[PDB]
Every structure is written in structure tokens, then in C-alpha cells.
Amino acid sequence: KLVDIPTKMRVERWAFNFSELIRDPKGRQSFQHFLRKEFSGENLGFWEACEDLKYGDQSKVKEKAEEIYKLFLAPGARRWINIDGKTMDITVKGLKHPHRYVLDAAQTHIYMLMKKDSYARYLKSPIYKEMLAKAIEP
């Protein structure tokens, strides 16, 4: 139960491409601090909830999909995040008959938004640069 301390190589790998950063627990954790600094923190919370919906306990899928919608996407939602019209339409139409992939269109849209609007800036930020400088080569 040791604290996960990323090696230099691992942290450098987060700069290889967006999927390496987001698919790494410590990478997401670091990216999350930066997203909150840039006021778009809920984007990653939503992405993770959708990942769980997809590959998680499948007996509560129908229930979880609606919960996620009400928590992140509905008007006035507590953890509201914006998605475009075409995406919302597909999501709402899909929710009339919930299934494992009902939120995939929304999750992908948010994924591409983070990749397009935040990934590069993150790598150029003090948070990443500090993470890299502090990580050491064993």
C-alpha cells in the first residue's frame, strides 16, 4: 500500500500522447489539478463516471446512466458541464432506452475537448514541468 511515485520515464511518457496521460492514474490526478486551475475540473469527473458506466457493474447500468446525466448534464446539474447540441441530442435520445454505451457520444466529445483545449497547455504548465523535474530516474 505504498504511495505511487512515478519515475521520470513514466512522467515523460505522459507527454507522448494524451491517452498515456489519461490512462495513467497519477497522470489523471495531475491533469485534474491543472483542469481545476483552468476552471474545467468537472470534465474529468464526467469522463471517469462514463468510463465506469461502460466497463463496470452491468446490473446497474440503466440506473447509473440516468444518475450521471442528472449529475453532470441536466439543466442546473450540480456538476454541470456543457456539451454541444448534436451530442446532447444523441444523449437524450439514447436515455429513453439506457444501455452500456448510451453516454459514449458525450464521453468522446468531452475527451476530444480536453485533448484539444487542455492537453498541450497542461504539458507547457508549471504543474507538469514540476512533476517531471521532481520525478527521478531510479
Swiss-Prot record:
The entry's comment on post-translational modification says: Phosphorylation is decreased by light exposition.
Name the tissues where it is expressed. Answer: Photoreceptor outer segments.
**Compartments, record wording:** Membrane
| Residues annotated as domain RGS | 17-132
Quaternary structure (record) = Heterodimer with GNB5. Interacts with RGS7BP, leading to regulate the subcellular location of the heterodimer formed with GNB5. Component of the RGS9-1-Gbeta5 complex composed of RGS9 (RGS9-1), Gbeta5 (GNB5) and RGS9BP. Interacts with PDE6G and GNAT1.
Summary of the function given for this chain in its UniProt record? Inhibits signal transduction by increasing the GTPase activity of G protein alpha subunits thereby driving them into their inactive GDP-bound form. Binds to GNAT1. Involved in phototransduction; key element in the recovery phase of visual transduction.
> What is the protein name given in its UniProt record?
Regulator of G-protein signaling 9
Quote the range of the complete protein represented: 283 to 420 of 484
